[PDB]
Amino acid sequence: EDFTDNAIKIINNATELAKQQANSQLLPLHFLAAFIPTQYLKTLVKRARYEWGDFERIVNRHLVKIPSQNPPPDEIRPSYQAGQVLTKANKIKQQQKDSYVAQDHILLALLEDQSIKDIFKEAGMSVDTIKTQAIELRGSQRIDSRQADS
């Protein structure tokens, strides 16, 4: 699979967050938190007529409560659910007939994950409303370059 520049940044930043926090595994939550300053999710939340801080503070609250491990893992590996997010992002890319796995596909996959759905509900936000913003954002524009999900 080929990834957009932004998708690579999301995946790398998610791993870095897990590393810095000494968490035992890479979780869907780490991928979601990687969307926080890339201006993409902020744009969607604003389009949905929600307040960014209402979302950000909930993700951060969950992030800092992930347990830490002593000593930290030498290698951080995805949880089963985190692996499913990546597998689903690829499937969504294929269904949408896009040329690169994009930040859009990762977000759309995250919105199907139960732990992530629980976080949006807690924040006071409709997952369906956010999802509709992601669907509408680019219309029929193909993700046909490594920068096309800007």
31, 14 Cβ separation under 8 angstroms: yes
The tally of CA atoms less than 13 A away on the side-chain side of residue 67 is 5
Q: What is the resolution of this structure in A?
A: 1.7
Please, which residues bridge with residue 101 across strands? 3
107, 120 Cβ separation under 8 angstroms: no
Helices assigned H by DSSP within the chain? 5-20, 28-33, 40-47, 52-65, 80-95, 103-110, 114-123, 127-137
Rounded CA separation 50/145 (Å): 30
Between 80-95 and 103-110, two packed helices, what is the crossing angle to 10 degrees? 120
Q: Report residue 46: phi and psi, to 5°.
A: -65, -40
Q: How far is CA 107 from the centre of its chain?
A: 4
59, 32 Cβ separation under 8 angstroms: yes
Rounded CA separation 44/108 (Å): 12
Technique employed here was: X-ray
Q: Give, in order, the Cα–Cα distances in Å from 87 to each of 1, 84, 101, 126, 146.
A: 11, 5, 10, 24, 19
Please, which residues bridge with residue 3 across strands? 101
